[PDB]
Structure formats: C-alpha cells, structure tokens
Amino acid sequence: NPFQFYLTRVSGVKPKYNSGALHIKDILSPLFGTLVSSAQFNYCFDVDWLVKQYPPEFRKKPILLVHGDKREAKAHLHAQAKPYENISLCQAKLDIAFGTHHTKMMLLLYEEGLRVVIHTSNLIHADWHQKTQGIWLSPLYPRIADGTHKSGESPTHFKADLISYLMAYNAPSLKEWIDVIHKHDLSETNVYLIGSTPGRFQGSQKDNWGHFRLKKLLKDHASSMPNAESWPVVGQFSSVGSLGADESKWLCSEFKESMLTLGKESSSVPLYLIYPSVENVRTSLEGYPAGGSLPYSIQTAEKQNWLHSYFHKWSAETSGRSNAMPHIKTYMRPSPDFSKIAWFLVTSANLSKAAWGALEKNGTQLMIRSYELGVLFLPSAFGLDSFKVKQKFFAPMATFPVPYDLPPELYGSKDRPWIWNIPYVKAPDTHGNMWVP
Numbered sequence: 551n552p553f554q555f556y557l558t559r560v561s562g563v564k565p566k567y568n569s570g571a572l573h574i575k576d577i578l579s580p581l582f583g584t585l586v587s588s589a590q591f592n593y594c595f596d597v598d599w600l601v602k603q604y605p606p607e608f609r610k611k612p613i614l615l616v617h618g619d620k621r622e623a624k625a626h627l628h629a630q631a632k633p634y635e636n637i638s639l640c641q642a643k644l645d646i647a648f649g650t651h652h653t654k655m656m657l658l659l660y661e662e663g664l665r666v667v668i669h670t671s672n673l674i675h676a677d678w679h680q681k682t683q684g685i686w687l688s689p690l691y692p693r694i695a696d697g698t699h700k701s702g703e704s705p706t707h708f709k710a711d712l713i714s715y716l717m718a719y720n721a722p723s724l725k726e727w728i729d730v731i732h733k734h735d736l737s738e739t740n741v742y743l744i745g746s747t748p749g750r751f752q753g754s755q756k757d758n759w760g761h762f763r764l765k766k767l768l769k770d771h772a773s774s775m776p777n778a779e780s781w782p783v784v785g786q787f788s789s790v791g792s793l794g795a796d797e798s799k800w801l802c803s804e805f806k807e808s809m810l811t812l813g814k815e816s817s818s819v820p821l822y823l824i825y826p827s828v829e830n831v832r833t834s835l836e837g838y839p840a841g842g843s844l845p846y847s848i849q850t851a852e853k854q855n856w857l858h859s860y861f862h863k864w865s866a867e868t869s870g871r872s873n874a875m876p877h878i879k880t881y882m883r884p885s886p887d888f889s890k891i892a893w894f895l896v897t898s899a900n901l902s903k904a905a906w907g908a909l910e911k912n913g914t915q916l917m918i919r920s921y922e923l924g925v926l927f928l929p930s931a932f933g934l935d936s937f938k939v940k941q942k943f944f945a946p947m948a949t950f951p952v953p954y955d956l957p958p959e960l961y962g963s964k965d966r967p968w969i970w971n972i973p974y975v976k977a978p979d980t981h982g983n984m985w986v987p
C-alpha cells in the first residue's frame with residue numbers, strides 16, 4: 551500500500567482482524583530501526599507501562615515526554631518519570647484557558663534515519679487494548695549527508711510544516727528535534743500535516759492551523775467535481791465540545807464550510823457525524839468502561855440537543871471492530887454512493903471548537919485553545935482524482951482503507967449519545983456491570 555494507515559491491535563477479535571494491525575511494541579521494535587532517541591507527544595502517560603513497550607536494548611535511550619499537565623497533575627507525571635534517568639519532560643504552554651495538549655506523535659531517531667508516527671492513542675495500556683485507534687507511519691527518512699545542501703522537502707511541504715508545528719512550542723527540547731528533522735530527507739512524504747496550536751491568528755496566519763488549514767489545503771490541492779453538493783462530509787470522533795445554541799453558530803457555518811471546500815472557485819451538503827450510542831458502548835468489548843474514554847458531559851449535551859439529529863452509530867464490520875469503541879478521529883468526503891472519497895484525514899481533533907478553532911472579532915481572528923495533529927490524504931498527492939474505498943479493511947492498491955462501515959447508520963429513535971457522567975443502571979453491560987460515575 552502507499553497509504554501506511556494502520557489500526558491498533560484489538561484483543562478479543564479473531565486473528566484475521568489483527569492481520570496488518572500494529573501494537574506499540576511493533577512500532578518500537580528493532581525491525582523498525584536501531585533506536586538512538588525518541589520523543590513521545592501525548593495527553594496521558596503511564597510511564598512504567600510505556601518503558602516496557604520499548605525493546606530491552608532500547609530501554610535506556612533518551613525519551614522526551616511532551617505533555618500539557620500543570621500544577622498537581624504535572625507533579626504526578628514527574629514522579630512517574632523519576633525512576634528513569636533517561637526520561638526528560640517538556641511541558642507545552644497552554645496560555646489560553648481550557649486548552650489541552652492533545653497531539654499524539656512519536657519522533658523516532660535511529661542509526662539508519664528518522665521516523666515520524668502520528669496516531670490517536672494515549673500511552674496507557676487501555677488505549678491499545680480493545681479500542682479502535684489509527685496510526686500513520688512515515689517512511690524511514692535518511693539523513694542528508696553533511697556537506698550536502700538539499701531541502702529534503704516533500705511535494706506536500708511536510709518537512710517545513712512539521713518544523714513550523716514544533717516551533718510553535720517555543721521549547722528548547724523541541725528545538726533539538728527541529729535540528730534533527732532539518733538534517734533528514736523527508737521528500738518521500740505523501741501526506742499533508744494539519745495541526746492546531748494555541749493562539750489567536752489573524753491575517754494569513756489564520757491559514758496555518760485548524761479548520762482554516764484544512765480549508766486552504768482543500769482549496770489548493772483538491773478539485774471540485776460535478777454534483778459536489780451531493781458528496782457528504784463525514785466526521786467521526788470520541789468527544790464533543792460545546793458547539794452553541796444551534797447549528798448556525800459554528801458547526802454548519804464555519805466547521806462544515808471549511809470541510810466542504812474543494813478547489814479555488816467560489817449549503818445542501820449532507821453532514822454525517824459518527825459517535826457511539828449508549829447501546830454501542832454497553833455491548834462493546836469493554837462494556838460501560840469504554841465510555842471513560844468517550845468524554846461528552848451532560849452539562850454540554852443538554853445545551854445542544856439539536857446536534858444529536860446528526861449522530862450515527864459506530865459500526866465497523868469491515869475491520870471486525872464494531873465492538874472496539876473508537877478513540878480514533880477521522881474526517882472524510884465520500885461520493886454520494888460512498889464508493890469513493892475525495893480525501894481522508896486521521897487526527898487527534900475531536901468535534902470541538904477548542905481543537906479546530908473558532909472565529910472571533912467579526913471573523914478576523916481564529917482562536918484555538920489546544921494542540922492537535924493529523925495527516926491528510928489527498929488523491930492529487932498520489933497521482934489520483936479520487937480514492938476507491940476498500941471493501942474489506944483487511945483484504946489496485948489505489949484503494950483507501952476506511953476502517954468503519956459506509957454508509958453510516960443513523961441513531962434509532964430510542965438511541966442516545968454516550969454521555970459519560972450520568973448513570974446507566976437499567977441494563978447491564980457486556981461484563982454484567984452498571985455504570986455509576
């Protein structure tokens with residue numbers, strides 16, 4: 551395949567559904583490279599568990615943990631890392647309130663080159679056990695020979711864009727990784743980087759991040775087709791923020807507007823949002839505890855009941871993962887019959903203004919609260935006009951492996967979105983348990 555898009559291994563499904571899936575131990579294996587140093591960007595870490603995922607021969611190499619924790623939470627992370635003298639920490643600044651360091655990325659420096667992994671999983675056992683998660687693996691990037699002056703840049707601008715993303719941290723430990731990236735040849739990269747970083751961006755800087763970055767890439771590197779108004783937008787996520795009193799406040803006015811962009815010329819487009827129902831969670835491999843990783847609060851949900859008419863069940867027969875609750879986040883643009891897609895994005899970004907950005911000051915300023923990162927697959931970057939949808943995820947390689955079922959199925963009249971902080975006590979889950987948060 552050209553795409554290098556993988557799901558994580560799921561315990562408790564038949565082995566055919568893990569054929570070609572990746573566990574964290576596979577990513578860190580000596581088969582992927584002879585590790586010299588690594589950086590782990592994430593939200594949540596179990597350091598004892600993380601260190602055991604590295605092969606023993608690599609377990610003492612330097613590891614940088616890039617996190618967003620403050621106050622008592624920051625102290626706990628430092629206490630976790632203290633027994634491991636090779637572990638350094640970088641606290642990403644979060645100077646806008648209610649922001650999160652949500653980016654999930656590995657930088658892996660080898661004797662043979664450099665690899666970048668952009669994925670969706672926290673660095674805890676539960677996130678790699680029975681969930682649907684997504685991974686993009688970069689090629690092995692060779693070092694540019696000293697004395698040679700080359701850009702090492704790809705047609706998607708990935709090298710400069712990744713450096714720009716890291717520069718926004720203003721962190722000395724990350725300037726070291728910027729210098730590593732500068733020394734490597736990333737020209738084989740066929741995906742576009744879509745990041746979010748905290749700030750208030752005006753003028754052209756608006757196009758650097760969040761949903762305006764997606765809009766700019768779709769304008770410059772995708773083309774509109776006849777009947778484009780008939781091509782739906784699909785968003786699929788594990789958390790929902792406060793979107794406003796109706797769809798015109800943000801969802802259908804600016805978020806959907808960016809996602810429906812195609813080409814440079816200047817809405818009826820259907821919007822499908824995929825988010826687990828209570829029933830999906832109750833009968834999952836984990837049962838109700840899967841809902842601990844599906845944060846949608848009752849306080850937020852009750853403000854926006856209009857939103858739930860957009861909601862569609864989680865179903866993933868194609869990858870054997872209907873019962874592996876999603877922590878992956880994906881966005882894509884299928885054709886009216888769902889047989890082709892105009893693009894596909896895997897990202898950390900949930901359905902949230904904090905992640906994607908919200909316009910302020912009469913539309914002159916894009917405000918983002920959080921760090922997010924994803925990769926965008928555009929047909930043009932592969933010499934194609936569209937991607938065919940892979941019929942069965944694990945069975946021409948111009949076919950993109952969409953990990954869940956199409957078309958998405960609307961919630962039934964008695965279905966409700968999973969809301970994590972209310973009790974579910976009238977029907978036991980897979981393990982015979984009730985949920986009382």
Ligand SMILES: Cc1ccc(C(=O)O)c(C(=O)O)c1
Nearest residue numbers: 593652672788789843844845
């Ligand atoms: C509210 C929140 C906080 C952290 C995460 C995460 O990094 O897992 C999530 C998620 O992605 O569901 C959601």
